[PDB]
Structure formats: structure tokens, C-alpha cells
Design a protein around this nucleic acid. Structure first.
Length: 165
RNA sequence: CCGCCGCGUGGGACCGCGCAGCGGGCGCGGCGCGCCGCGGCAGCCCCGAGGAGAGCGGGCGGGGGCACCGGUACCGGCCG
């Protein structure tokens, strides 16, 4: 129920010639360009994953002004066990914070599979994570690394940066 | 202030244990035993230790057990 959703829905209705979205989030970047994150419901992420590179390209080409990213919305629970007083309810591991952040990171760059992760602990600077991408693909993704860092920082307060190795 | 392996409040890093869905309606103030939509949930498996065990393939070796079998030599006997 906001302007962006109206035109993106119209777009989607134009593209076919069955799948719907949950919400849309827009995150700012240092440059005037912004990012739009589309929250896909979990059961159909794979439905929006097969041919989604074309989908994002067409969406960007229709309404310019900021890049489009597709991610799923996952829930995080804050207790390993829940004590109802009589028995105990165990939290599934899929609902942890560490798993969710890793899945988000994979989803942000879904077409390109992450090759490694490292976190550095400088003497004074806040610890930061740096990930490693395939050396084959670069110029395709070189121009969208600041946006990736910004969106990852927004969703998860953890900061990061990108390189190729 | 000083004879406490017990009692209460707090913290909860470290050390060890938690198999048996949830939420709403019937339903009484609350809790149970039950009856109901699944119509509300992302319903319900960390990874796979230069730990271990099991498996396939490859060659390696005076490793083990059973039967079988050759060769001089020591000894004894016999022909010359």
C-alpha cells in the first residue's frame, strides 16, 4: 500500500506476455542512487529464483532510479527452549540469527555463489567481514558492491566490504 | 569483624542437562481433561572435526593356520 508497489505490480502484470510479492523496502546509498528490496514469501523464493536476473534487469529498465533486489523474509526467534511449565519447546535451528544472516547474504548475490568469508579484527576499528567472490565475474558486479554493502548493513547492523579472489 | 557444605535476592560469562508442535474458538475468573478451522506459523534436520567407525578400488608384505612336497648334509646298513 504505497506508490512503488503500484507501479511494480503493474510492471509484473505486463511482464508475462501466478506469483505475488509481500512488500518492498527502499534503502539509500551514498550516491543519489538507491536500492529497492522486494520481500518474497519463503515458500516461493525458488519460484522467483530461476529466471530472476532477467526480471531484475527488466524492472530496472522500466522504472529507473534505484536497483532492485529480491530476498525472502525469514523469522528470528529469541529462545533456544520455551518453558510452558509442563514441557519444553525447542527452537528449530533455521530460526537462529546466524543462519538467517548467512541466508540473506547468499540471497543478495544469489546468481553468484560466495567462495569464502573472513572477518578481520583491527586494533581500533570495529570488526568487519569481507567476503570473496569468483574472479571470473567482476565488471558485472563491480558496479553494485556499494549497494550490496549498504543493504547488508541496513538489514544486519554488521558491516562489510567486497573483493574478488 | 571472626565458629555456616543449609535459607533469600541478583548476575548469568564458564561447566553440564531439557524426548513428548504452537496459536486461536467451544468454555465458566484461572488451570487441566476434551471437542473444533487448519482459516493463523517460513510449522518441526547447524555443519559434517588434519575425532572415530563402516564402504569401494589398488597394489604391499620372512603376518597366521591346514594339507602337500624337493634338496644336499650328519648317522646307520649293504655290493665292489
Amino acid at each position: 500500500l504505497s506508490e512503488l508497489e503500484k507501479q511494480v505490480a503493474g510492471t509484473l502484470l505486463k511482464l508475462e506476455d501466478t506469483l505475488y510479492i509481500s512488500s518492498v523496502k527502499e534503502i539509500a546509498v551514498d550516491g543519489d542512487k538507491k536500492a529497492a528490496v522486494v520481500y518474497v514469501p519463503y515458500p516461493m523464493l525458488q519460484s522467483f529464483q530461476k529466471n530472476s536476473e532477467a526480471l531484475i534487469l527488466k524492472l530496472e529498465k522500466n522504472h529507473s532510479g534505484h536497483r532492485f533486489i529480491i530476498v525472502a523474509n525469514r523469522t528470528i526467534m529469541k529462545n533456544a527452549y520455551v518453558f510452558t511449565g509442563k514441557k519444553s519447546i525447542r527452537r528449530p535451528r533455521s530460526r537462529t540469527m546466524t543462519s538467517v544472516y548467512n541466508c540473506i547474504l547468499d540471497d543478495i548475490c544469489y546468481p553468484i555463489h560466495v567462495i569464502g568469508k573472513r572477518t578481520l579484527y583491527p586494533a581500533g576499528s570495529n570488526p568487519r567481514l569481507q567476503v570473496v567472490l569468483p574472479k571470473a565475474v567482476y565488471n558485472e558486479v563491480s558496479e553494485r558492491t556499494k549497494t550490496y554493502s549498504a543493504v547488508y548493513k541496513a538489514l544486519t547492523e554488521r558491516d562489510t566490504e567486497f573483493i574478488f579472489m
